[PDB]
Amino acid sequence: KPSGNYNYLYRLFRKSKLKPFERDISTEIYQAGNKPCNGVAGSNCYSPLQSYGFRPTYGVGHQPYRVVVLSFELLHAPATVCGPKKSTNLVKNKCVN
Amino acid sequence: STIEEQAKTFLDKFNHEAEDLFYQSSLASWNYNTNITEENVQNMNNAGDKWSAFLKEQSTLAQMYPLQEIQNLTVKLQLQALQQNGSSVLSEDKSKRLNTILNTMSTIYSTGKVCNPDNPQECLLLEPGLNEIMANSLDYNERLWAWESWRSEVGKQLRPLYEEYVVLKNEMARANHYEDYGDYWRGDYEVNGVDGYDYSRGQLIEDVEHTFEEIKPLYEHLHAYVRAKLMNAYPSYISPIGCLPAHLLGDMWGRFWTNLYSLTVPFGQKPNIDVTDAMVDQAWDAQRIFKEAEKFFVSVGLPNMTQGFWENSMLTDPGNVQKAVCHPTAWDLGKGDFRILMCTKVTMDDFLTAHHEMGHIQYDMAYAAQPFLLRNGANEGFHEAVGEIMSLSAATPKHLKSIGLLSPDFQEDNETEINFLLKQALTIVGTLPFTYMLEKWRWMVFKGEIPKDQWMKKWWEMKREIVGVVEPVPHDETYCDPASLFHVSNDYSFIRYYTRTLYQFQFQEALCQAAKHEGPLHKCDISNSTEAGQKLFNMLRLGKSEPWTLALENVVGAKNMNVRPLLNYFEPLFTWLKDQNKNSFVGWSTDWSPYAD
Ligand SMILES: *[C@@H]1O[C@H](CO)[C@@H](O[C@@H]2O[C@H](CO)[C@@H](O)[C@H](O)[C@H]2NC(C)=O)[C@H](O)[C@H]1NC(C)=O
Ligand SMILES: *[C@@H]1O[C@H](CO)[C@@H](O[C@@H]2O[C@H](CO)[C@@H](O)[C@H](O)[C@H]2NC(C)=O)[C@H](O)[C@H]1NC(C)=O
Ligand SMILES: *[C@@H]1O[C@H](CO)[C@@H](O[C@@H]2O[C@H](CO)[C@@H](O)[C@H](O)[C@H]2NC(C)=O)[C@H](O)[C@H]1NC(C)=O
Ligand SMILES: *[C@@H]1O[C@H](CO)[C@@H](O[C@@H]2O[C@H](CO)[C@@H](O)[C@H](O)[C@H]2NC(C)=O)[C@H](O)[C@H]1NC(C)=O
Ligand SMILES: *[C@@H]1O[C@H](CO)[C@@H](O[C@@H]2O[C@H](CO)[C@@H](O)[C@H](O)[C@H]2NC(C)=O)[C@H](O)[C@H]1NC(C)=O
Ligand SMILES: *[C@@H]1O[C@H](CO)[C@@H](O)[C@H](O)[C@H]1NC(C)=O
């Protein structure tokens, strides 16, 4: 939207890199220095959530893109979700298979 | 838990927030600049002051990381470019006084008036009419009256303000460990901690004075020719062995001599190339010019336009009521948005200005990957040189005879060669002495070598010694001539116009060797040659990440600025000139004066 769309965030400060397929929703103050800050913004203690400034007058490379990541998995189940095929018509008076 | 790992943590957040706020402010500024209304003024000023206050708060916050323990060089560059207090290190009263006197100087320069001695109700401002009388007239007394009155009725107001601005700026620069305000200006060419590309602030003066010493053998001949020709437009006013009166040069101060071309054209019976009737009679519109420029730029190997550039840029003048000040500029609003603003017509000068602007656009497109604080030229002089070599190469007959604007044969003769080279010389090599002299004078004033009771005397002595012009009326220590210039009264640096002129021709000769040229340098084009684009893009994508004396090596092969490319470019005119002064006296004596009689 014009004048900014501040409803799409992305966290850019984490103490440890993420392990595969983990989701974190914490909003505690990331503390960079050596002094406790007890949860207030200021010097060497930053808030880790920031928002995209999406606007229509952007160049390709800053416009919001939507992503849908599919994942496939087979643990042990014999008959599960599967794609559709072609219902071979049933013939009669003719042996074959 | 170190004093370095916090720097990057702070710099990331600063980069994000600064990019956001800067985009907001620049969008507001554009919205004003292309649509002049009343509410847009406040809508722009609001975002401007918000961005300024945010930058000030980040500056007073970033003083917690001492620059002495930072080891990485990019973060050091960013912190040092962010740490400088700049102004506001003074007390409050001094700052208010300095701001007031700066605004007063700008206002007095902008709205000065001088009217006739025989009719006191017909005075004209500077811009609409004074530098028009000084540019189009041919009468001696009229030019003399204009040049004398503009300095006697507007210059005399700037001296008691300049004599305080000097002291205030000296204190503001001494409060930051610079020893004067001149060193603050030269602090742009400063480079520390590279072990092979060092450049101390003090070597700039030596470099300038050692490169100007090689131009005089050409400037002297050009001056002798211009004088031997001027002695036919105003007879019995110029002596064959004296200087040129400072009011017969072409404009108010003598910065450019290009307005003399109607008097000193070598062969006045051959019209130089001007493809303006072909463009008009072939139905060329305001978009075809930019399409051709984009095609030329994509020929050498640089990317296409961003497609956000064609929908939002303002290439045409909005007709009915959209009054917009259109001085051609290229914008870098950020976040991948590049726009161009110019009220273009269908002529040749705009056809070259389009290429000039697309030069800046390509430059800003190249280094858009660096952090925010490093989105700028390698120094204050690279941008205009990069933007200028394109237009330099886009006006050669070989290039214009392949696009279609010219006939496919167009027989060439050395007379048009000389014409074009001389018209180029009256603007390129005609301003270097004046620029060098004015910068040397301002340095010697700020440093304190010239006591405040010897300003005008030393100024006119240096003008007689270096540039070669003499005043037509004595000037005592009540006047103030340097302040009557735009760049001097508004506190703008001036040394960049002397380094751009050298970087331009250095880049040109460096790239013209990649395209494997054959003839003289002024007939080359870098189109259709992909290696030139690569050599140029190797420097375009750096920004301020590396010291400028490194980005200068990647394209040329040297470490400092040089002057051999300029003389290599001007060799033919040099020879023809050296064969034109058999009877005249090349040089000048500093004794003759238009009133010593
Ligand atoms: C140039 O600025 C003026 C002043 O803001 C604009 O005029 C009004 O702009 C508002 C903003 O949306 C509109 O709602 C009004 O309808 C406009 N009034 C008129 C009489 O046009 C103007 O629109 C701006 N120019 C352009 C091209 O948008
Ligand atoms: C600290 O310095 C190092 C090298 O001196 C930088 O490392 C470069 O980082 C960029 C992007 O992160 C890479 O594209 C380069 O390949 C890296 N160079 C090398 C030699 O590996 C590092 O970026 C600097 N720190 C910061 C915060 O920029
Ligand atoms: C920038 O300005 C400040 C003053 O506004 C200079 O003085 C330092 O200010 C900090 C902040 O209060 C103090 O903690 C220091 O004790 C001051 N003195 C120092 C650091 O010597 C500061 O020095 C200036 N920095 C630069 C690079 O000019
Ligand atoms: C750059 O190269 C292109 C392609 O080789 C040139 O375009 C062709 O030039 C020939 C020469 O007369 C024409 O016959 C073709 O019709 C052109 N092709 C097109 C698609 O226009 C172009 O002239 C070269 N430019 C320069 C300055 O050398
Ligand atoms: C332009 O080139 C022509 C030759 O292409 C030059 O004409 C010759 O100049 C020399 C110089 O003394 C004479 O000895 C020859 O007799 C000339 N040739 C003819 C056919 O008359 C001309 O001087 C050149 N002009 C410039 C300004 O470079
Ligand atoms: C640039 O755009 C033109 C037409 O818009 C296209 O033909 C050409 O392939 C493009 N080149 C690049 C490098 O995108």
Hey, what are B163's tokens? 């004599």
Hey, what are B547's tokens? 């010291």
Question: Is the CB of B13 less than 8 angstroms away from the CB of A61?
Answer: no
Neighbours of B347 (CB within 10 A): 15
Those residues with Cβ within 8 angstroms of residue B256's Cβ, 6 or more apart along the chain or in another chain: B250, B426, B427, B430, B431
Q: Is B402 touching ligand 4 by the criterion CB < 6 Å?
A: yes
How determined? cryo-EM
In 3D space, the residue among B327, B318, B315 whose CA is nearest the CA of residue B289 turns out to be: B315
Query: In chain A, whose CA is at the least distance from the CA of B63?
Result: A43
Write out residues with Cβ below 6 Å of ligand 3.
B 63, 83, 85, 89, 176
In 3D space, the residue among B424, B393, B473 whose CA is nearest the CA of residue B266 turns out to be: B424
Question: Is the CB of A43 less than 8 angstroms away from the CB of B61?
Answer: yes
Q: Is B357 part of the annotated catalytic residue set?
A: yes
Hey, what are B573's tokens? 């005119």
Question: Is the CB of A61 less than 8 angstroms away from the CB of B64?
Answer: no
In 3D space, the residue among B440, B456, B435, B443 whose CA is nearest the CA of residue B170 turns out to be: B443
Burial pattern B376-388, b for ≥16 Cβ within 10 A else e, equals bbbbbbbbbbbbb
Query: In chain A, whose CA is at the least distance from the CA of B13?
Result: A46
Sign of CA dihedral B553, B555, B561, B567: positive
Nearest to B16 among A34, A44, A50 (CB): A50
Sign of CA dihedral B144, B145, B151, B156: positive
What whole-number distance in Å separates Cα of residue B132 and Cα of residue B167?
A: 35
What whole-number distance in Å separates Cα of residue B332 and Cα of residue B362?
A: 11
Those residues with Cβ within 8 angstroms of residue A76's Cβ, 6 or more apart along the chain or in another chain: none
Hey, what are B133's tokens? 């009388």
Ligand of minimum distance to the alpha carbon of B419:
5
What whole-number distance in Å separates Cα of residue B471 and Cα of residue B151?
A: 12
- Residue B339, classed as helix, strand or coil, is strand
Sign of CA dihedral B588, B590, B592, B593: positive
What whole-number distance in Å separates Cα of residue B533 and Cα of residue B530?
A: 5
Q: Nearest C-alpha of chain B: how many angstroms from A59?
A: 4
Give resolution in angstroms.
4.0
Q: Is B487 part of the annotated catalytic residue set?
A: yes
What whole-number distance in Å separates Cα of residue A20 and Cα of residue B299?
A: 45
Cβ proximity of B164 and B101 under 8 Å:
yes
Alpha carbon of B336 to ligand 1 centroid (Å): 26
Those residues with Cβ within 8 angstroms of residue B529's Cβ, 6 or more apart along the chain or in another chain: B300, B514, B515, B516
Residues paired with residue B329 on neighbouring β-strands, in sequence order: B341
Sign of CA dihedral B510, B514, B519, B524: negative
Nearest protein CA to atom 12 of ligand 4, as residue: B402
Q: B399-405: long-range contacts at Cβ-Cβ below 8 A with a sequence spacing of 24 or more?
A: B399/B525, B399/B527, B400/B273, B400/B275, B403/B292, B404/B278, B404/B282, B405/B275, B405/B278, B405/B279
What whole-number distance in Å separates Cα of residue B381 and Cα of residue B514?
A: 23
The HSE-up count of residue B512 (CA atoms within 13 Å, CB side) is 22
What whole-number distance in Å separates Cα of residue B245 and Cα of residue B233?
A: 13
Q: Is B42 touching ligand 1 by the criterion CB < 6 Å?
A: no
What whole-number distance in Å separates Cα of residue B427 and Cα of residue B256?
A: 6
- Contact list in B for residue A13 (CB cut-off 8 A) is 9
Q: Is B39 touching ligand 1 by the criterion CB < 6 Å?
A: yes
Q: Does B16 touch chain A (CB under 8 A)?
A: yes
Nearest to B12 among A12, A34, A60 (CB): A12
Cβ proximity of B192 and B198 under 8 Å:
yes
Residues paired with residue B124 on neighbouring β-strands, in sequence order: B114
Hey, what are A18's tokens? 């993420």
- Contact list in A for residue B337 (CB cut-off 8 A) is 57-59
Hey, what are B289's tokens? 């010019």
Q: Is B304 touching ligand 6 by the criterion CB < 6 Å?
A: yes
Q: Is B414 touching ligand 5 by the criterion CB < 6 Å?
A: yes
User: Residues of B within the annotated binding site for substrate?
Assistant: 255, 327-328, 497
Cα end-to-end distance, chain A, whole Å? 62
Hey, what are B317's tokens? 């003048």
In 3D space, the residue among B333, B368, B375 whose CA is nearest the CA of residue B78 turns out to be: B375
Cα end-to-end distance, chain B, whole Å? 80
CA-CA distances (angstroms) from residue B93 to B163, B202, B471? Answer: 18, 32, 40
Neighbours of B443 (CB within 10 A): 21
Residues paired with residue B339 on neighbouring β-strands, in sequence order: B331
- Contact list in A for residue B1 (CB cut-off 8 A) is 33-34
What whole-number distance in Å separates Cα of residue A58 and Cα of residue B254?
A: 45
Q: Does A64 touch chain B (CB under 8 A)?
A: no
Q: Is the backbone of residue B263 left (phi > 0), alpha (psi -120 to 50) or beta?
A: alpha
In 3D space, the residue among B533, B514, B512, B511 whose CA is nearest the CA of residue B303 turns out to be: B533
Out of B148, B487, B531, B571, pick the active-site residue: B487
Q: Which of B4, B11, B13, B21 to mutate to test the interface with A (most CBs of A within 10 A)?
A: B13
Those residues with Cβ within 8 angstroms of residue A32's Cβ, 6 or more apart along the chain or in another chain: A44, A45, A46, B5, B6, B9, B10
Within 66-95 of A, beta carbons closer than 8 Å to B belong to none
